[PDB]
């Protein structure tokens, strides 16, 4: 009826609006995808940087330009949040392996905030390029942006297990994810073990992956939390600071030196809290408190009084202030576009399945490209064999269309060079869509419209003697490449060989040492 006013129930409107908001947040800002381990914001930011050409071996670009490109094209949710995401990706105390290379002030663990968008400059890290390898080979599905004027990837064809490696943290409506970082070498070793035996136990995966590895080195107190998290997806882990108790040789006084602090702990807030506890007489025996972080470590001096044990004071500080914190693991991620609590083996299996899909799609694309180029090279070789009557036909023709019709209508003899060329790999080297009407048929080659157009686009520069041999060599190389790609597609073992070689290369290039210590308790 198209009435100006209609009734709506408070229940129906509330339910529809809140369910729409909750599902939108859950699927589209809060949780990461299990495959590439990135949220949509990170995916769109990296895609914008890659499209601009912020390569790891090129000059920096200002954050304002990248943020404007992200907001204008891909991500319509305001520039301040996008710049904060870029800042978190650039800084090294947040991510275990930084996806962005920063040039300027990006904050610190002392609590300093990052510089404004107009000062800093950004650039992709070298790891982010392997996070987007073979993106151009249609290895992942592309989806429209908010306007529909551009295309964004649905997922990145990653070579790194970014979810386990860099972790994640987000607050959806019903859900909330919290995944710690890990060591890339240990994670790749676990992936290789899973590839070797897919019925591998969580005990074996934990032998290869002893536990998390935060960007700030520290001590993990227990292991029961790690085992519970990696066998169920939830568990509390206690992270302690690498404090000590120095004893002066000359005098009997003592000092406590905090070399490291837990993950996601602010130095300034921690020092303020310790000062408040000392002022309120909550913790006794603290003679003084300062920082001596002289860019050769991280030194926090806590002087002990003469009438104090010192170790008792250190234990009291571990109990009370934020020198010990509990990391609540909650491994929630999007799997098949829905939230799911998942353990370590599920994440590794999802990554290996993603690698299978990516390599198969890449091989299909490369095979199609090679077959098309071989088709064009067959046309060019057959044309160069019969270049004189082709020149006569084109000269006699009034227009290029008549030349196309004449070339298509006239079958062509191969000649010695093309006949010798088109002997090895005559089968399984033609494009699949090509009908049997065209191609070689009892010596006489038959051209298509595309081949005739390619022949007409041939230049006089390529009529020299050397370019003919160049075309023959290119055709032989394409035949070898097609044979190798078909061998990859035929055998499932060769797919695993290729994936294992790629993972070993990734472990070699970006391998790193473990920072934390998983002590027993």
């Amino acid at each position: 009826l198209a009435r100006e006013i209609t009734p709506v129930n408070i229940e129906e409107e509330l339910k529809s609006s809140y369910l729409d908001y909750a599902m939108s947040v859950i699927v589209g800002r809060a949780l990461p995808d299990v495959r590439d381990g990135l949220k949509p914001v990170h995916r769109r930011v990296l895609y914008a940087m890659n499209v601009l050409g912020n390569d790891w071996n090129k000059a920096y670009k200002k954050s304002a330009r990248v943020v404007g490109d992200v907001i204008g094209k891909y991500h319509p949710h305001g520039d301040s949040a996008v710049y904060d995401t870029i800042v978190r990706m650039a800084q090294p105390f947040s991510l275990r392996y930084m996806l962005v290379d920063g040039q300027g002030n990006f904050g610190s663990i002392d609590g300093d905030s990052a510089a404004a968008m107009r000062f800093t400059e950004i650039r992709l890290a070298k790891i982010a390029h392997e996070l987007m390898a073979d993106l151009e080979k249609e290895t992942v599905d592309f989806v429209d942006n908010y306007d529909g004027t551009e295309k964004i990837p649905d997922v990145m064809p990653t070579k790194i297990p970014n979810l386990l490696v860099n972790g994640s943290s987000g607050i959806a409506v019903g859900m909330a994810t919290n995944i710690p970082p890990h060591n890339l070498t240990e994670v790749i070793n676990g992936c290789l073990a899973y590839i070797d035996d897919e019925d591998i136990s969580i005990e074996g995966l934990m032998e290869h992956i002893p536990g998390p590895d935060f960007p700030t080195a520290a001590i993990i107190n227990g292991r029961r939390g790690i085992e519970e998290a990696y066998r169920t997806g939830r568990g509390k882990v206690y992270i302690r600071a690498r404090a000590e108790v120095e004893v002066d040789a000359k005098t009997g006084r003592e000092t406590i030196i905090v070399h490291e602090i837990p993950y996601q702990v602010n130095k300034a807030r921690l020092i303020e809290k310790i000062a408040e506890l000392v002022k309120e007489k909550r913790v006794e025996g603290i003679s003084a408190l300062r920082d001596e972080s002289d860019k050769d470590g991280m030194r926090i001096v806590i002087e002990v009084k003469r009438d104090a044990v010192g170790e008792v004071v250190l234990n009291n500080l571990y109990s009370q202030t934020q020198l010990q914190v509990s990391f609540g693991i909650n491994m929630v991620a999007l799997h098949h576009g829905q939230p799911k609590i998942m353990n370590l083996k599920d994440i590794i299996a999802a990554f290996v399945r993603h690698r299978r899909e990516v390599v198969t799609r890449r091989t299909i694309f490369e095979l199609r490209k090679a077959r098309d180029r071989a088709h064009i090279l067959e046309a060019l070789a057959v044309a160069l064999a019969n270049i004189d009557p082709i020149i006569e036909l084109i000269r006699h023709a009034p227009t290029p269309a008549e030349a196309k019709t004449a070339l298509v209508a006239n079958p062509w003899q191969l000649g010695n060079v093309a006949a010798m060329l088109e002997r090895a790999g005559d089968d399984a080297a033609r494009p699949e869509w090509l009908e049997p009407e065209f191609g070689v048929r009892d010596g006489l080659y038959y051209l298509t419209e595309q081949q005739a157009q390619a022949i007409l686009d041939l230049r006089l520069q390529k009529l020299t003697g050397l370019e003919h041999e160049k075309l023959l060599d290119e055709y032989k190389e394409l035949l070898d490449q097609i044979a190798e790609l078909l061998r990859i597609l035929g055998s499932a073992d060769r797919l695993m060989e290729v994936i294992r070689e790629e993972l070993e290369l990734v472990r070699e290039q970006f391998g790193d040492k473990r920072r934390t210590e998983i002590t027993a308790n």
């Binding site: 408070i10 509330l14 809140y18 908010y146 306007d147 529909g148 299909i364 695993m496």
Partner: protein, 536 residues
């Protein structure tokens, strides 16, 4: 009518007719001073009371919302009808005094009845240049002193506030811009209600400080409170927060029906001259389908007439519903199998008793799957002899990405309802495309081997000149666009908030907006499962 074709659902010509008639009658009432003598202002649905009209139009290239042709969405028609009506109806009113006076008498009687229908009230002091009345500095108040003629628009910020303030009617419209997301009163303590954002709404409405011994809804300064947030997800969230505030703190206002919801458009879509406003993604999908079937003809043979537009619309609707179902069923079975099952012959439960027939059917299915394959997957069949029920359930193996999996088509899948719908769509599309079939979109010609090719070609041709403008809030809309869509009472589309059941409303508010997370997560998961499992 448009080219002697009726339009049940009106169209642009109907809107132009309504706007011109209302404007001319209001101008005539103001000029002659009949409104002043009666002391009542006429509104829409009173100038249309007891009316008969016929609006015939002849467009050379008309454009309709659908092949049923119930709406005319041609943008060119509204302006011409409006201009001609605004001239000639005014000329008619000037020439004929007696009939104009009789019609004005009828309109005044209707307006008096409408005013008598309203409840008792009191005129309220309004913010003005000379006097502010202790109201907020961000309130762009109106000039009407009487409530039940004024209306307050609650918007999301100062940019949306400026866009709404520039385009409005200063006599009636008042605007009170908020600041982003507001407090969740369900979670927040009552002492936290003393906040800058929420106190601004309390001051303007003049329901006192929402206390037990002070909340007096009779002193409400506007009897129409309109929640015009943005047309996106966070706008919906802020709408839910505002509804929580109104229901929990001022339930009498919601019961009396003063709370309204505006529906600004999220998209504007343009194709050459024509333009149109779209609300949500499903409306965008319907519009895309409508352009795809706009001037589209499908021939089953080289020499055969084009199909009916409504029949093609029904086919495309069934196809899209089945494709949505197949996307829902991506977890259970491969999409390629489910798509291929449309074109294959139906398999009934009686066929399961015989073994050779099932082997022939699954062999044909797997052969067609292998023939049309363009990825690395390889399809193979296998029949499992169920000795319990003397059945023969086929199984289709697939080795995709080097991973082998089995998808047995159980006895429940044959009579699962999803396969029934697939079979019905197949029965529609067994032979609607011969070898020589083609489609046209004017002078363009395209032979098509399958229905998917025809649909894809129609979509690609539809999206050639298409341009889309997504409004990320009301600050991106011009004041004219925001006025014409969801501020003008003629072209308004509002929703009156009402409480169907108090108990159910209280339970839903507590579950969705309360402190406890477990019922909220359970509610979200259950609704997600219900959405996924619409088709049995």
């Amino acid at each position: 009518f448009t080219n002697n074709i009726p339009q049940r659902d009106g169209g642009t010509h109907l809107a132009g007719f309504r706007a011109a008639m209302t404007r001319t009658l209001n101008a005539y009432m103001d000029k002659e001073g009949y409104s002043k003598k009666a002391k009542v202002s006429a509104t829409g649905d009173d100038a249309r009371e007891g009316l008969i009209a016929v609006v015939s139009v002849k467009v050379p290239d008309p454009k309709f919302s659908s092949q049923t042709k119930d709406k005319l969405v041609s943008s060119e028609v509204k302006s011409a009808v409006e201009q001609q009506m605004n001239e000639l109806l005014a000329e008619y009113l000037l020439e004929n005094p007696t009939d104009a006076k009789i019609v004005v008498g009828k309109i005044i009687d209707a307006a008096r009845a409408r005013e008598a229908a309203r409840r008792a009230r009191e005129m309220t002091r309004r913010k003005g240049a000379l006097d502010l009345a202790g109201l907020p500095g961000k309130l762009a108040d109106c000039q009407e002193r009487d409530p039940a003629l004024s209306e307050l628009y609650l918007v999301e910020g100062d940019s949306a506030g400026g866009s709404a303030k520039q385009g409005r009617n200063r006599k009636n419209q008042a605007i009170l811009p908020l600041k982003g997301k507001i407090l969740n009163v369900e979670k927040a303590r009552f002492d936290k209600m003393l906040s800058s954002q929420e106190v601004a709404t309390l001051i303007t409405a003049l329901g006192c400080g929402i206390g037990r011994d002070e909340y007096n809804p009779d002193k409400l300064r506007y009897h129409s409170i309109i929640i015009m947030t943005d047309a996106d997800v966070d706008g919906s969230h802020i709408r839910t927060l505002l509804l929580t505030f109104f229901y929990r703190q001022m339930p009498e206002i919601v019961e009396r029906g003063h709370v309204y919801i505006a529906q600004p458009p999220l998209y504007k879509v343009k194709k050459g001259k024509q333009e149109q406003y779209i609300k949500d993604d499903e409306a965008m999908d319907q519009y895309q389908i409508s352009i795809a079937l706009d001037g589209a003809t499908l021939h089953t043979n080289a020499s055969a007439p084009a199909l009916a537009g409504e029949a093609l619309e029904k086919l495309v609707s069934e196809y899209n519903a089945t494709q949505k179902m197949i996307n829902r069923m991506e977890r259970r079975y491969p999409k390629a199998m489910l798509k291929e099952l449309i074109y294959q012959p139906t398999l009934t439960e009686a066929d399961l008793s015989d073994e050779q027939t099932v082997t022939r059917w699954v062999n044909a299915l797997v052969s067609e799957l292998n023939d049309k394959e363009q990825h690395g997957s390889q399809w193979k069949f296998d029949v499992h002899t169920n000795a319990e029920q003397n059945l023969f359930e086929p199984i289709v193996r697939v080795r995709t990405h080097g991973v082998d999996t089995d998808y047995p088509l159980d006895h429940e899948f044959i009579t699962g309802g999803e396969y029934r719908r697939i079979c019905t769509l197949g029965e529609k599309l067994r032979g609607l495309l011969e070898e020589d079939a083609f489609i046209e979109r004017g002078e363009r010609r395209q032979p098509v081997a399958s229905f998917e090719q025809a649909l894809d070609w129609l979509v690609k041709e539809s999206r050639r000149g298409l341009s889309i403008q997504r409004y990320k809030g009301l600050g991106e809309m011009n004041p004219e666009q925001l006025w014409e869509t969801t501020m003008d009472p003629e072209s308004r589309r509002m929703l009156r908030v009402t409480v169907k059941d108090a108990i159910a409303a209280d339970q839903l508010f507590t579950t969705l907006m309360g402190d406890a997370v477990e019922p909220r997560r359970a509610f979200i998961e259950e609704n997600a499962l219900k959405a996924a499992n619409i088709d049995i």
